RNA sequence: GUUACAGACUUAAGCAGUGGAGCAUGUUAUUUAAUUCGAUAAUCCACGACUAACCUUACCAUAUUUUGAAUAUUAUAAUAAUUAUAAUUAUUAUAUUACAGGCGUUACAUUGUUGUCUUUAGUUCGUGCUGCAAAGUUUUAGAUUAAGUUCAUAAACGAACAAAACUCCAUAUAUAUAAUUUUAAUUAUAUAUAAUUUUAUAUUAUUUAAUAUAAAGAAAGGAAUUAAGACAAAUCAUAAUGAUCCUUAUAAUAUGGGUAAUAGACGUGCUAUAAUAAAAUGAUAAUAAAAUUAUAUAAAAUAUAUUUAAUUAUAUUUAAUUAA
């Protein structure tokens, strides 16, 4: 009864089995929703900043594309910029996207504007920044391989750069790269089989504290309580969000040069449900209150000679 | 399995640990505000460990309660005003307060927490400060002498083993210091 | 093991009710041999298929929260005899509708025991028939500790179930929760 | 050392990897006002061995930055198909508050531990000494204008007061002091900082007090104390002033000690 | 994969980041010092200017830096080095903020108002006049020099035409 | 736990040992250690973190929040690659997944799949040619719904060929694609004389169409409606003269033009099986 | 707001180096020179 | 203007209203120098507009601005910061064109968003199969659910978007925390668990499903989410953009006026037409919740209206707190 009493006090774990709780590897933090991280006891100050945050992604964005001499102009695509306002610092962050060992010994355009956010000892522009906010600014950048793991960046990237693929129509090929960017993973699968790794470090955990114990609620060491347990073996296993699971674009607007209607179309892949929150213990939790937390929405509007048209990006994440 | 995990780890797995309150002299408490939980409760955890290691009888996060800021809006751009919107934005309130700390100690913790603070999560402090009836700011030179004295052998570097330096507080140090500084007053 | 458990290793959703039913009557069956007669290989092919008390305080009373609307009643049940005090004054004083007070009497209506409690009832929140009702609910719940037996009782009488009933809030475009603003087709 | 890039003359002796990011770094560091140096140049031919590149290339690279590459040497991989070895957005941002709660929890073990050394055991001002609490409050990450707001509160019973001077600097107090708990305080918010409020507070009660110490054609023995103000605040907040009678309690209906005797025998101690 | 290289937590280290408001005497002279320090323009919160850069040594704390009745656009005017740098670290200031020093204004006697008007009523309203303003200028803040001249126009020792200057 | 130092700087490096030895003296040996259940400071399974790790740690040089360097030294200067690849496995591959004229091998893949048919020769020797590309539309109370109707013979050159009907709402090239898979389904071996030209002069009526084929002399060509010559092409008939009367609806002839060569037709060695004779070919017997 | 924030112009001044393209700009210009072709440009302004 | 079920605030009961009165507000019409513009069947009419004195405003009268709010190009000159009396840069000034600017016109060029059908149960995908085919099957013999949701039967098998579920609020329980003076522990807030409830006896219809009874439970709601398509539904007056038109004027500033005009008409409301209903009074102050207070919330108290005083309204003057 003493064994089952201090059991019962120590019943913590990962949740997904079916006393366990979401990890920082299996959800969102809800700040990660709003894209000023901020709380100031002064509205009007919090207010103030969060407008500067607003007016230095205007900039970081025009500073984004670069021209080589009026030969090649590389439109870096980036994503919304999230600014994280501790009581010592400023930290903006975004993810980004650019398109044998001979770049050893120049240095790209891309790689020079990484290098002014933050190398130029005086110069660079989270120096420049800091004089807005009153605290130390830190940019970093994050390279993204593919165009189609950040929403906003795949949405901007088909909005700016492939103009002549959706202008008149949807050429054919192009349709066919959308829909065959991923290998029609089996989501039920791999949700279950999360779930299955989620049980089984779960009874591990328990066979531990069952070898432990052979009022307070002390067990043994902890050595013995993750006997098998290590950095090689569970995070992986446990990071929730992997397998872009389905995604659907949608352009829309006057994307037609002989009609003068407009043209709504669609490209579905996949699926928009996830089976992990469907049979087990993790829930599903929505980003302020309207957005399921593994799906991301995004659009990005560019002028044609015709007129507006925008581009919808929703990709699902197991 | 043969591999010695010492005590520091053992807490850091474990809940954080409070040292007793000796007596009731609240020197500080310290309110953290945030729009959200999960960072807020990791922070005041964060707070409380320091203040028990080379700490102060910290109470701990008591959850004063949330606000709620309402706002309702017409959805559509124009017109259609029978369809409406609602939005809210809950400030989280969580109430540390330090009860038995000589200044210096409790103003070291609170420059650690500004040092390593969070994302999300604001802060306001109010000290308390248990000061005799009858003052006198008088007696003037020889107390300011005294008060950089004491600030003196606060920042004294003990053993320069690569330690953590500031540009800044060396520079205020040497402000400190110097006779251009002392003649001030007078 | 469950239809759902059942489903993982077997059909998953080609799974049907009546598959599983057949499997239950097939398992069932083996089962019910003898336990003396049975053999190695039926349970290892079997084998796939398994798998606080309230009391009173130091001076002898029952403490028991009660709530309706926005009310809250603490109430301490007491074996003395059958006096009555709504948050320290008379029950006459504080509770002018008498239904109230029959109300909050019929807990110990129910039983045979008007008359040989007595009850400190300390409310707060709501209004007056709110109160009422949650000081009944409490009572019954304190009874309830004094013999178990007549628990069941309570709740067939309908004094242990917790009246849920909440004010619905105003929703955007009506006027109160369901009232409507006039419609016009014309 | 660190100041390492700046110096193109020493890095000659250095290995071909190390001397490459001497050179990143010096570009880094001063990207507009970049100028080539010939040490620098001599140092990146002798690298040349490490990364497959002739000495004509390097050295036209060198000159000439990504114009050069182009004339040394293409198809949009956009919509290339996931080859499984990058993480999406939402995984991504997991994992860095994963990384973030790893270094807390390194901070917490190794440098909390090490704050221990900067300990001093409390060194009580006694309240007979000391009544008076000045407040102080400070917005850490922002500039309040409540950061200048300091509130000073005394127990007027533990100021050094005779008692008919006590009952006259209750009245010149007014509403500042409270009669259920005998408790004198006062806020000022009027001067820009925080310790000229203080100050100012501090002369307010030595006034209050020389007034209260006069007794010379000014006694006030007949002007009673004024609690409207106490009782407005009381009326205001609720009260919870009643409580269970003593005589309703039965302490022999209380629950008795059952006797558990495995309990009782496992007490060897 | 590598070993966590330990740096020691330090006072030195957590200075800058000591609360501005602190009971403190020893706190308040740093606080002045570091206070000091920003109105100089010295790099915290930012990385400082050596002799390394010479063209691009920017900044943007000039005399009216985030404002708009000053008539220009952004101005990127020179940073001095770490060498060569002022810092300002007035006396009135330190008044203010290490000890707890404050002007109280100056109450208007009644024969410097007999000095201009004859009548004693009209002197006495005078008087209660300037004495109702100092209070009320005491509690709002505004400028050592601004509020002295506003109090001065308030009694009538000096004309409005003062202030629309 | 409380050990000795020795055993610490054993199993940890120099830099920690004074901080360890700090923590012991500060925490008593009798503690309680309670399990904070409503928030979890520490991670899901037990690290030792003297080391930091590459990818579950920030990366060292890489300016972040929680930076804990001075605001000019970042050793991050090449922003070409990524900073922080995946730990011990490079790839994150799901159980049972595996790494990557066009569309024809698709087709090719996929009806292999469903069908057990050899791919490269789908690829290689059956050669496609659309009949009829309609579009079509449905009246749905959403509205007239339009779907793109294609009609495609494929067939190798050696008296294989087949018909394929496919159907798509989304571009024609959907239908297309659809069209020859049902095609290649549908691969049908045609009789015919010499390798070039049908056995006897046919005439057969498919639903409305009336057809009538002749059998021609070598050299003769193809002189028929355009889907028969199509069809013909694609099923190895060189040689072949014939008439369409009544209706000439396009699909019709390819339907009916394909069932008159499988059914119509009997090769003269049937017929010789059948009657119990010899069925000579003069021509050939001469030799031309 | 602050109406020192940076802009564009300022991204030339602090990164030289740099060929930036603000696209709104840009696409303004091209608009401009569009008009200018087909006779639908600005009419000159008025001095007197 | 059809067959037969099913549907609900559809109807029927029922309770309170509108419609009559006066006022408020929106609309119309007409007026006006201007009564700015749009919304105008359900799906306009306290709607856009969560406050029209000036402003806001877009309208009108009279005045006066003309590279103007931007970006770039080309020149003269002046001031300030930095360096070791010169120079580099940053700015400003005067001009110089391209232009800037436009609540001007077209949501029948667009974006995004919204209304109605709609929390309605539909919408598709491969693929397979039937029909020469458009198409059909899937998506239904048979029933049922709130339901394309679930049983069965079926040339179908799956699927995606929908439905449901996860979500939020509220509830019950547990744990943690709060030195029970920031206390309301009768609380607040993080983390769990809990139900789309379960079990059994009977009575009707065919192993199940509805009724009833019983015993076990705190166990009973609301919110968000409103698919595809359609209505060339609404919006160029949130904002942006295409085309087009204005460029000493259709752009910009000030002073006043207007948006508040009034024959009839139309909605929404408010106050009424008195005794199952109105008014005075009720200080050991009968009983709430939710939310706001550094572009503030303003307590006590004095004075006048007012011979006592209370009430109500102002003034006097700011105690306390920027807040469990
Ligand atoms: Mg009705
Ligand atoms: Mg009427
Ligand atoms: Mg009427
Ligand atoms: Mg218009
Ligand atoms: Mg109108
Ligand atoms: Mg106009
Ligand atoms: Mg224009
Ligand atoms: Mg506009
Ligand atoms: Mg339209
Ligand atoms: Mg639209
Ligand atoms: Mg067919
Ligand atoms: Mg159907
Ligand atoms: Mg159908
Ligand atoms: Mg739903
Ligand atoms: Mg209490
Ligand atoms: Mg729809
Ligand atoms: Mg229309
Ligand atoms: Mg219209
Ligand atoms: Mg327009
Ligand atoms: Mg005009
Ligand atoms: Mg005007
Ligand atoms: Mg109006
Ligand atoms: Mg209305
Ligand atoms: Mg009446
Ligand atoms: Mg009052």
């Known amino acids: 009864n003493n064994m089952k009493r201090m059991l019962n006090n120590n019943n913590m774990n990962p949740a997904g089995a079916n006393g366990n709780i979401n990890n920082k590897l299996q959800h969102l933090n809800n700040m990660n929703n709003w894209n000023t991280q901020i709380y100031n006891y002064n509205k009007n100050m919090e207010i103030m900043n969060t407008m500067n945050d607003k007016l230095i992604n205007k900039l970081l964005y025009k500073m984004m594309t670069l021209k080589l001499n009026n030969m090649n102009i590389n439109k870096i695509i980036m994503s919304k910029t999230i600014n994280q306002h501790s009581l010592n610092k400023l930290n903006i962050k975004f993810y980004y996207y650019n398109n044998n060992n001979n770049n050893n010994y120049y240095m790209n355009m891309m790689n020079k504007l990484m290098n002014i956010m933050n190398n130029n000892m005086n110069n660079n522009l989270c120096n420049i920044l800091s004089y807005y906010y009153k605290k130390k600014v830190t940019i970093e950048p994050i390279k993204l391989s593919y165009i189609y793991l950040n929403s906003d960046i795949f949405s901007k990237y088909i909005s700016l750069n492939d103009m002549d693929k959706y202008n008149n129509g949807i050429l054919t090929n192009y349709q066919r790269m959308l829909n065959n960017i991923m290998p029609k993973l089996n989501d039920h699968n791999i949700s279950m089989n999360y779930i299955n790794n989620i049980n089984n470090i779960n009874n591990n955990k328990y066979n531990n504290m069952i070898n432990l114990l052979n009022n307070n609620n002390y067990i043994g060491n902890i050595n013995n309580i993750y006997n098998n347990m290590t950095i090689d073996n569970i995070p992986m296993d446990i990071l929730m969000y992997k397998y872009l699971v389905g995604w659907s674009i949608k352009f829309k607007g006057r994307l037609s040069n002989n009609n003068g209607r407009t043209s709504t179309t669609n490209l579905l892949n996949g699926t928009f449900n996830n089976k992990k929150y469907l049979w087990s213990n993790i829930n599903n939790n929505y980003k302020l209150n309207y957005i399921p937390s593994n799906h991301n929405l995004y659009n990005n509007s560019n002028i044609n000679k015709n007129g507006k048209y925008n581009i919808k990006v929703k990709l699902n994440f197991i | 399995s043969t591999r010695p995990y010492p005590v520091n780890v053992e807490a850091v797995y474990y809940a954080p640990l409070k040292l007793p309150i000796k007596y009731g002299d609240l020197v500080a408490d310290i309110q953290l505000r945030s729009y959200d939980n999960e960072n807020l409760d990791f922070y005041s955890d964060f707070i409380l460990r320091t203040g028990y290691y080379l700490g102060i009888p910290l109470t701990g996060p008591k959850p004063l309660p949330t606000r709620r800021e309402r706002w309702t809006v017409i959805k559509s751009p124009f017109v259609h005003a029978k369809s409406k919107e609602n939005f809210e934005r809950h400030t989280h309130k969580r109430l540390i307060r330090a009860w038995d700390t000589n200044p210096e100690v409790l103003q070291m913790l609170i420059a650690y927490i500004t040092k390593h603070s969070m994302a999300g999560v604001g802060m306001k402090c109010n000290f308390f400060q248990r000061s005799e009836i009858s003052l006198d700011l008088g007696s003037d030179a020889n107390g300011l002498e005294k008060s950089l004295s004491n600030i003196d052998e606060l920042y004294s570097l003990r053993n320069d083993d690569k330690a953590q330096t500031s540009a800044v507080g060396q520079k205020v140090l040497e402000l400190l210091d110097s006779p251009d500084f002392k003649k001030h007053l007078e | 093991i469950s239809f759902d458990e059942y489903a993982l290793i077997g059909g998953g959703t080609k799974l049907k009710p009546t598959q599983y039913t057949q499997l239950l009557y097939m398992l069932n069956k083996l089962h019910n041999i003898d336990p003396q007669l049975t053999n190695d290989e039926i349970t290892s092919e079997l084998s796939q298929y398994y798998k606080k008390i309230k009391t009173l305080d130091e001076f002898g009373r029952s403490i028991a929260v009660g709530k309706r609307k926005s009310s809250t009643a603490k109430v301490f049940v007491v074996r003395g005899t059958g006096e009555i005090l709504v948050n320290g004054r008379q029950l006459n004083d504080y509770f002018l509708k008498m239904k109230d007070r029959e109300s909050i009497m019929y807990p110990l209506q129910v039983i045979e025991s008007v008359g040989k409690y007595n009850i400190f009832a300390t409310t707060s929140g709501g209004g007056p028939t709110g109160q009422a009702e949650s000081i009944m609910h409490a009572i019954a719940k304190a009874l309830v500790v004094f013999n178990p037996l007549l628990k069941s009782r309570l709740h067939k009488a309908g004094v242990l179930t917790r009246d849920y009933r909440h004010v619905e809030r105003k929703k955007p475009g009506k006027k109160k929760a369901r009232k409507m603003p006039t419609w016009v087709k014309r | 050392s660190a100041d390492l890039y700046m110096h193109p003359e020493k890095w000659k002796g250095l290995p071909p990897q190390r001397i490459l990011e001497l050179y990143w770094e010096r570009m880094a560091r001063l990207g507009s006002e970049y100028k080539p140096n010939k040490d620098e140049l001599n140092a990146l031919l002798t690298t040349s061995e490490y990364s497959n590149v002739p000495v004509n290339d390097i050295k036209k690279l060198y000159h000439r930055g990504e114009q050069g590459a182009i004339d040394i040497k293409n198809r949009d991989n956009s919509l290339r198909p996931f080859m499984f070895d990058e993480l999406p957005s939402q995984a991504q941002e997991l994992v860095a508050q994963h990384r973030e709660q790893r270094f807390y929890n390194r901070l917490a073990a190794y440098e909390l531990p090490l704050l221990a050394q900067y300990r001093q055991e409390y060194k009580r001002p006694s309240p007979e000494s000391h009544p008076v609490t000045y407040r102080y409050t400070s917005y850490v990450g922002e500039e309040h204008p409540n950061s200048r707001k300091v509130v000073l509160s005394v127990k007027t019973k533990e100021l050094g007061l005779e008692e008919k001077s006590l009952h006259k600097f209750r009245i010149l107090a007014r509403s500042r002091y409270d009669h259920t708990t005998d408790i004198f305080k006062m806020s000022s918010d009027k001067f820009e900082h925080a310790s000229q409020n203080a100050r100012y507070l501090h002369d307010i009660l030595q006034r209050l007090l020389a007034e209260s110490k006069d007794l010379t054609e000014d006694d006030f023995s007949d002007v009673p104390l004024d609690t409207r103000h106490t009782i407005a605040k009381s009326l205001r907040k609720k009260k919870r002033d009643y409580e269970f009678p003593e005589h309703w309690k039965r302490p022999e209906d209380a629950p008795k000690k059952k006797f558990d005797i495995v309990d009782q025998l496992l007490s060897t101690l | 994969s590598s070993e966590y290289v330990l740096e020691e937590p330090t006072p030195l280290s957590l200075l800058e980041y000591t609360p501005q408001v602190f009971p403190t005497k020893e706190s308040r002279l740093v606080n002045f010092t570091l206070d000091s320090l920003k109105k100089s323009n010295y790099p915290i919160y930012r990385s400082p200017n050596l002799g390394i850069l010479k063209v691009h040594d920017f900044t943007l704390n000039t005399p009216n830096f985030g404002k708009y009745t000053p008539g220009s656009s952004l101005i990127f005017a020179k940073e001095p080095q770490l060498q060569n740098l002022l810092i300002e670290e007035d006396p009135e200031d330190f008044h203010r903020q290490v000890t707890g020093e404050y002007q109280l204004l100056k109450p208007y006697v009644k024969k410097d108002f007999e000095k201009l008007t004859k009548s004693k009523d009209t002197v006495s309203k005078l008087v209660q006049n300037s004495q109702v303003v100092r209070l009320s200028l005491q509690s709002v803040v505004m400028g050592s020099e601004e509020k002295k001249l506003v109090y001065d126009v308030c009694s009538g020792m000096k004309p409005i035409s003062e202030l629309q200057q | ?288 | 707001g602050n109406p020192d924030i940076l802009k564009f112009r300022h991204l030339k001044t602090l990164y030289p180096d740099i060929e930036f393209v603000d696209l709104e700009e840009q696409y303004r210009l091209s608009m401009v020179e569009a008009k200018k072709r087909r006779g639908k440009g600005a009419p000159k302004k008025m001095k007197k």
């Open chain 6, 1 to 288: 736990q409380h050990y000795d130092e020795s055993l610490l700087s054993r199993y940890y490096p120099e830099s920690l040992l004074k901080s360890i030895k700090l923590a012991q003296q500060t925490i008593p040996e009798d503690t309680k250690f309670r399990v904070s259940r409503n928030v979890e400071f520490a991670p899901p399974y037990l690290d030792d973190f003297t080391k930091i790790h590459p990818f579950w740690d920030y990366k060292p040089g890489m300016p972040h929040l929680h930076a804990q360097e001075e605001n000019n030294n970042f050793s991050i200067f090449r922003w070409d690659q990524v900073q922080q690849p995946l730990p011990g496995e490079g790839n994150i591959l799901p159980p049972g997944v595996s790494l990557p004229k066009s569309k024809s091998a698709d087709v090719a893949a996929g009806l292999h799949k469903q069908t057990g048919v050899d791919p490269d020769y789908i690829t290689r020797k059956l050669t496609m040619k659309p009949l009829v590309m309609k579009r079509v539309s449905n009246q749905t109370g959403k509205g007239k719904i339009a779907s793109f109707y294609a009609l495609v013979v494929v067939g190798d050159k050696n008296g294989m060929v087949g018909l394929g009907e496919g159907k798509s709402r989304e571009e024609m090239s959907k239908a297309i694609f659809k069209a020859h898979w049902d095609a290649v389904r549908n691969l049908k071996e045609i009789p015919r004389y010499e390798n070039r030209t049908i056995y006897g002069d046919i005439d057969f009526r498919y639903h409305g169409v009336k057809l009538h084929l002749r059998s021609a002399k070598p050299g003769f060509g193809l002189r028929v409606n355009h889907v028969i010559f199509e069809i013909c092409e694609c099923a190895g008939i060189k040689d072949l003269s014939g008439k369409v009367y009544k209706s000439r609806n396009d699909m019709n002839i390819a339907k009916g033009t394909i069932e008159a060569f499988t059914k119509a037709q009997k090769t003269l060695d049937e017929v010789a099986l059948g009657r119990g004779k010899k069925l000579v070919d003069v021509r050939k017997v001469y030799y031309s």
